[PDB]
Structures are given as C-alpha cells and as structure tokens.
Design a protein around this ligand. Structure first.
Ligand code: 1CA
Length: 253
C-alpha cells in the first residue's frame, strides 16, 4: 500500500466526471420535412450513436467492469432507455435551462417538434424531469451519480449471475449520493428528493418503452427506421420485458 498512491487517487465522483462521454450529434438533416417518420427515425439514429458511447462509458465505470460480462450486458440493455431520457433531461437543463429538449446540439426540440414527433406526451414527461432539475438546482456531481444508479435500476426478476457483487456496487453508489447531498439538516430532505425522482423514472421509462416497442413492431407500416444498435437491443429486450423478466428496483413505494 502506497501512502502517495492512496492520497492521489480520484474519488469515484472525479472518475465519473473524467469518463462522462462527450455530447453526441444526431446528424439531423434540416432539409427534410419534419414529419413523425423522419423525426423518429432520426431520434433512433441518435439513440444508436449515443448507446455506443454509453457502452464505452460503462466499460470504464468503477465497479461495473468487475461484474460478469453477462450481467453488464443485461444491465445496459435493461436501462438504456432510462439513461437516455435522463441524460436528455440533463442536457436540456444545462444547455437550455429546461426551455427545450436538447436531444443533441444539432437537434433541439421545441413544442412544435414535440407535436410533429407524434410522441408529444412522452416529450412532456421527459421535459418535466428537466423542470425538476431546475427546481432542485441539480448539480453535475449528483447527476453523474444518479445516472450510475439508473444503470443499476432494473435487473432480472431472478437476478444476475453475481447478485452479491451487484448489490454491493449499488449500495456503494447510493452512499456516494448521500455524501454528495450532505456537502445535515437539509441533507436528508435532499437525498429523499433525489431517490424519489429516481423512482419516478420507472413509470416514465415504462411509457417510453411501450411506445418504443410499439413502433418497433410496426416499424414497416410506420416507416420508422432503427439502427442495428437499437435493433440489437430491442430485439432481445422486448421479449424479456413483456415476459415480466425485468424487475424494477425502487427506493420507496
Ligand atoms: C426510442 C424513441 C426514440 C429515441 C429517443 C427515445 C427517448 C429518449 C432519447 C433521448 C436521446 O437523447 C436520444 C434518443 C432517445 C433514446 C424515444 C422514446 C420512443 C421513441 C421511438 O420509439 C421511435 O420509434
């Protein structure tokens, strides 16, 4: 054990900041008409590019790499939607002050786009999270920890290969959050507000997935395109979810 090495080691929070992926661009073609077909296909394309960066992020995520390859794949598949809309809400909060849905720098949604996307209510749900970020003045530190917790929010009804190791890393990250919001009195209130917001993601993600699975099934009739990345994810996720094999983890309720 090195006295120096231990003192110079980055806190998990600092590591989260270092590994956070750079903002990804959607490659949105502004010359094409803003119809549901084009906007949804474009969002799905963006989703793909983002998931590729998410996997690289999870690969170097403290504690995550120590999980069986099998569990890592499962966790990612189960949570990809949760991480997507949560990151969406964050960028919207930071770069727009929650005035718009900042899917990407080249793709910012206003009320109009929301209507044209044919998923207006789902957009309102995600936007409502951003509004909360404003009311709470959420910090980037709290954000990164919470995003990690979401990665570990849905598991197999029966469990992962290394259930013990998983509950460990999870509990450690929860503790990391407690420490953040403490930097008590208003600390306990803060922590509960954040865990309560994390739980609320499940009903939101449930509705987002329902529409995702629907548009996936009717992809041809709707003319909605999906990148191989998402085809790969949804193909395997959809049946597990509809089979009741996905188990949501809550803090309350
Ligand atoms: C999957 C989805 C398109 C892709 C988006 C997702 C909502 C969250 C999200 C946030 C992003 O920053 C990139 C795209 C994305 C992952 C939508 C919910 C339903 C919609 C469709 O099902 C289109 O067919």
């Amino acid at each position: 054990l090195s006295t120096i090495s231990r003192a110079l080691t980055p806190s998990p929070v600092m590591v989260l900041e270092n590994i956070e992926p750079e903002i990804v661009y959607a490659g949105y073609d502004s010359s094409k008409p803003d119809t549901a077909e084009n906007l949804l296909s474009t969002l799905n394309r963006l989703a793909g590019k983002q998931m590729i960066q998410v996997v690289k992020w999870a690969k170097v995520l403290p504690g995550f790499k120590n999980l069986p390859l099998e569990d890592q794949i499962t966790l990612i598949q189960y949570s990809w939607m949760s991480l997507s809309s949560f990151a969406l809400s964050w960028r919207s909060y930071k770069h727009t002050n929650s005035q718009f849905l900042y899917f990407a720098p080249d793709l910012v949604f206003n009320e109009e786009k929301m209507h044209q996307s044919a998923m207006y209510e789902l957009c309102q749900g995600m936007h409502q999270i951003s509004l909360q970020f404003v009311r709470l003045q959420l910090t980037f530190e709290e954000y990164t920890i919470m995003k990690v917790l979401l990665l570990l929010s849905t598991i197999p009804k029966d469990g992962l290969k290394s259930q013990a190791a998983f509950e460990e890393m999870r509990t450690n990250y929860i503790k990391e959050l407690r420490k953040m919001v403490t930097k008590s009195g208003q600390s306990w209130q803060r922590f509960y507000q954040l865990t309560k917001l994390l739980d609320s993601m499940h009903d939101l993600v449930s509705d987002l997935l329902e529409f995702c699975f629907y548009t996936f099934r009717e992809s041809h009739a709707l003319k909605v395109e999906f990148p191989a990345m998402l085809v790969e994810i949804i193909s395997d996720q959809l049946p597990k979810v509809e089979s009741g094999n996905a188990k949501p983890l809550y803090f309350h309720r």
